[PDB]
């Protein structure tokens, strides 16, 4: 909520910095098997239960 | 209604984050994590939760200190500057 706690604002910040796609220069490395970011998250679909 | 109407009223938690396992198990009215009873010194581990032990036992983390012990034993728990 608005009147929240720092223990939760921390965990929301982490989720904000995690919510991005994959860097395209990872796909150019040699023995690469990562196509996309399979751990993505958005508020519509999956709630992080904290 | 016991279903769709009575699922609107689910807006106040009973579990919060534990400091010991980091997951939403810390009950608030009784103050006892349901995965590793936090105020209690012993972590919950029952032999019937044999899968649950896999998820929380040794190896499942970093092993900051422990993973150098086999290295330090192989050499004799030794000391000092190496060599020339």
């Amino acid at each position: 909520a608005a009147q929240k706690s720092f223990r939760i604002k921390q965990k929301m910040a982490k989720a904000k910095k995690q919510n991005r796609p994959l860097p395209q220069w990872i796909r150019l490395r040699t023995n690469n098997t990562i196509r996309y970011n399979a751990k993505r998250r958005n508020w519509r679909r999956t709630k992080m239960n904290i | 209604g016991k279903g769709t109407p009575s699922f609107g009223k689910r807006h106040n938690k009973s579990h919060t984050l534990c400091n010991r396992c980091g997951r939403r198990s810390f009950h608030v009215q009784k103050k006892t994590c349901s995965s590793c009873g936090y105020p209690a010194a012993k972590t919950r581990s029952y032999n019937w939760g044999a899968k649950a032990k896999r998820r929380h036992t040794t190896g499942t983390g970093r092993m900051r200190y422990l993973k150098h012990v086999s290295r330090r034993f192989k050499n004799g728990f030794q000391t000092g500057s190496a060599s020339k």
């Binding site: 796609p21 994959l22 395209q24 220069w25 150019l28 196509r35 996309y36 970011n37 | -």
Partner: protein, 58 residues
Amino acid sequence: RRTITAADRRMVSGVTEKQYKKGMKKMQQLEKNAINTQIRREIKRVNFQTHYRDELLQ
């Protein structure tokens, strides 16, 4: 004064905007290709309610 943009960072680190557009669209394609399978292999065992009451007696 703004001597930096994310496009410029990724240009410095290899990828051009053409490469970025194409590789992005492929990563979008694959997500949908997988979501297809998750919606495909689920419709079977998703309506398997444990306690349906069947509102029909008389």
